Amino acid sequence: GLRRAEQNTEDGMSLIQTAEGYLQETHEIVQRVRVLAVQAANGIYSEEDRQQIQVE
């Protein structure tokens, strides 16, 4: 059981390790929206250019 308990504990971390791996890609996306929001907030763009920002 203790040997069984140990093997589960690695498997528990593998599940935990993977979900954090998926959150890694999610976080990099939200920052990319954030930087594009800075450029989109500048005053020298027109409706067409900010719409192209909204496309991405």
Binding site: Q7, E10, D11, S14, L15, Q17, T18, G21, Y22, Q24, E25
Partner: protein
């Protein structure tokens, strides 16, 4: 996908792949126990010759 490829491959290895070092200890234990049991059986066969005198 690469991260999940890493994390899942590690997940299966800890279930399917053996411990080479940990198994050598059990491998030697059974190799020793085999020789001990082999000799005791050889002792046991000759045990019955005592009454032949």
């Amino acid at each position: 996908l690469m991260n999940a490829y890493e994390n899942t491959q590690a997940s299966e290895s800890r279930i399917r792949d053996t411990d080479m070092a940990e198994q050598m200890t059990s491998f030697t234990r059974y190799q020793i126990l085999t020789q001990a049991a082999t000799s005791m059986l050889a002792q046991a066969n000759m045990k019955s010759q005592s009454v032949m005198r």
